[PDB]
Chains A and B, each alone.
Chain A
Amino acid sequence: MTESFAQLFEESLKEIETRPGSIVRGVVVAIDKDVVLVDAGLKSESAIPAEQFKNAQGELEIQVGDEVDVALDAVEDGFGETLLSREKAKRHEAWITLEKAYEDAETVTGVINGKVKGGFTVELNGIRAFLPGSLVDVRPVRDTLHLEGKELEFKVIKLDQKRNNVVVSRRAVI
């Protein structure tokens, strides 16, 4: 029963997913001070820099043997390496969270960076939005300095997902 590699490989190909940008799970093989070896099992156990696994306190919550989720960029690089990125998965999660916040009016805290093309702009955890300049604040003192760069817990007014931008607002809560 010489099971042909053709059909075995076909089974394998339907077992996994191979496309740039795809969010794929992986097994954390080893952790070092410098990089973290992860394995999505395509051609090579990739290595991702350490800061991509650190929180605000710079903590490596990830441990050995943990199953993490990273976005594959390219299955190969010319250097015999599968290229994986954790920050891309973070952006994916942040945008899904922004979607849910739009659905449920969840007040997310982000730095309203400053003037945008049509008003002011906001940025929160790797996401960016614009709010009309008429919506600077609820109690609009003549000082606009405290309108930009500070923490605002706003609900997602809209999102032009294709444009990689959203529409923030000084909503009912704000």
Chain B
Amino acid sequence: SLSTEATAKIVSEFGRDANDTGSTEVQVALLTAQINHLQGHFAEHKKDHHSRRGLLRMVSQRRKLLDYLKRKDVARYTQLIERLGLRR
């Protein structure tokens, strides 16, 4: 998964204090970081379906979170996806 230091770094970057770990932007950033991380793994190990399933769960959860954020506050949604560099 993601190391403790990386998680704390992302929380500091995206949350409005050290202790806000549940906010939607923080969750999406953590999911995006992990998803980008695993691309090397699934570029070398191409028959690891049991892990690719967890990867797809991560992608889908990020989709649901982005949809909620977009429908709840468009400004945060645009800022977040522009910072993270995600299409739609």
Q: Direct A–B touching in the complex (beta carbon < 8 Å)?
A: no
B-side interface residues toward A, CB under 8 Å? none
A-side interface residues toward B, CB under 8 Å? none
